[PDB]
Amino acid sequence: FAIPYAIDVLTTGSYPRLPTCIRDKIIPPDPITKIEKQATLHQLNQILRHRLVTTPPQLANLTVANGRVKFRVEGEFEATLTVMGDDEILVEDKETGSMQISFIHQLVQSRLPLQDMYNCLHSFCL
């Protein structure tokens, strides 16, 4: 018997299609929600605290902003040395005043160990 199909009409669905998991995703994309983004941010941020607890005198002060951690170190060149890391593997977004900063931005990701960047970033500014 074709029992699963008889169930499908009851649920207004179909059995044969769910087994293939590649085609069903090729056609449609997925949208996101702002509230879901905040909820995902908060739950992720809880893991950020747990990892950072295990883990830099100046960096001791940090700000967990909307969708990003944030660290600030005073610097020069019309900008402070600022890094925002979100995931150990972290993903870093750095704010400054441009191509050289991108080179520095690339280097930090390449190094990405936490104290090493703390020292490498400190050394360059000095």
């Binding site: 018997f1 074709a2 029992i3 199909y5 008889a6 169930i7 009851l10 649920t11």
Partner: protein, 58 residues
């Protein structure tokens, strides 16, 4: 260890089973109706190359 087992405790429980409730129970109830529904279009499986269409489109 207390914090380790709380995350484990939450994952153990199947949360939001209301979806499975209204889905599985609805399928069950009637179990005597689904059997009768499937007894009359049985052998439903083998393409329909336009042989049945032309009898209808005409």
């Amino acid at each position: 260890q207390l914090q380790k087992q709380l995350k484990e405790a939450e994952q153990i429980l199947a949360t939001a089973v209301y979806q499975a409730k209204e889905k599985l129970k609805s399928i069950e109830k009637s179990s005597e109706e689904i059997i009768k529904y499937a007894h009359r279009i049985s052998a439903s499986n083998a393409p329909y190359p336009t042989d049945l269409e032309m009898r209808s489109g005409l």
